[PDB]
Amino acid sequence: MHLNPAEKEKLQIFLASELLLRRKARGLKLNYPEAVAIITSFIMEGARDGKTVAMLMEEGKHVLTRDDVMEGVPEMIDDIQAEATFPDGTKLVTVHNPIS
């Protein structure tokens, strides 16, 4: 596979998102690390799909809403940043106030 350091590390974000998604599917209100993971993996997978940075900057605000997460989680997350390989190489996606 030729994994480099980031590829190995970022695998764990996908895994944490999978975890958090199962917790959300069984009815739990998500916590801070869970919500961050879900939105982060959303971004990276969106970059793998070929969405643009501009698309993901806007889509990232609509992945989880305040009723998905515990009290105070929306206000804990000022933004979420993630880098992934888009069709045009590594780019950074910054999602401002992703959860309202």
Partner 1 sequence: MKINRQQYAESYGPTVGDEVRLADTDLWIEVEKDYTTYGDEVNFGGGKVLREGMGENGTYTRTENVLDLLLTNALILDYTGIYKADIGVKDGYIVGIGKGGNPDIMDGVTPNMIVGTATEVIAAEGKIVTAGGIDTHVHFINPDQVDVALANGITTLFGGGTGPAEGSKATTVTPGPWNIEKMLKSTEGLPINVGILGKGHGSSIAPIMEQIDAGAAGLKIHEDWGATPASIDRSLTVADEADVQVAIHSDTLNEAGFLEDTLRAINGRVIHSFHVEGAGGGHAPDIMAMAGHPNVLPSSTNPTRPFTVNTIDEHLDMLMVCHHLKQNIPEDVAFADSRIRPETIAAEDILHDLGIISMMSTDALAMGRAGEMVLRTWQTADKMKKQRGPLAEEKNGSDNFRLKRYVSKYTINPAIAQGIAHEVGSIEEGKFADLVLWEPKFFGVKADRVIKGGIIAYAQIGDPSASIPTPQPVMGRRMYGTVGDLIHDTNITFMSKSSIQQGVPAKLGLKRRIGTVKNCRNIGKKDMKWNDVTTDIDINPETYEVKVDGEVLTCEPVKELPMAQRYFLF
Partner 2 sequence: NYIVPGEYRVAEGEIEINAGREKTTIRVSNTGDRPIQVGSHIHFVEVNKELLFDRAEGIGRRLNIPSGTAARFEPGEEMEVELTELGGNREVFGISDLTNGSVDNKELILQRAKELGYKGVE
Chain contacts with partner 2 (rule: CB under 8 A)? 71-72, 75-76
- Interaction between residue 9 and partner 1 (CB under 8 A): yes
Angle between helix axes 5-25 and 32-48 (nearest 10 degrees) is 120
- Interaction between residue 70 and partner 1 (CB under 8 A): yes
- DSSP, collapsed to helix, strand or coil, labels residue 63 as coil
What CA–CA distance (Å, rounded) separates 59 from 84? 16
Residue nearer to partner 2 on the CB measure, 67 or 71: 71
Give me the least distance between CB of 66 and partner 1, in Å please: 14
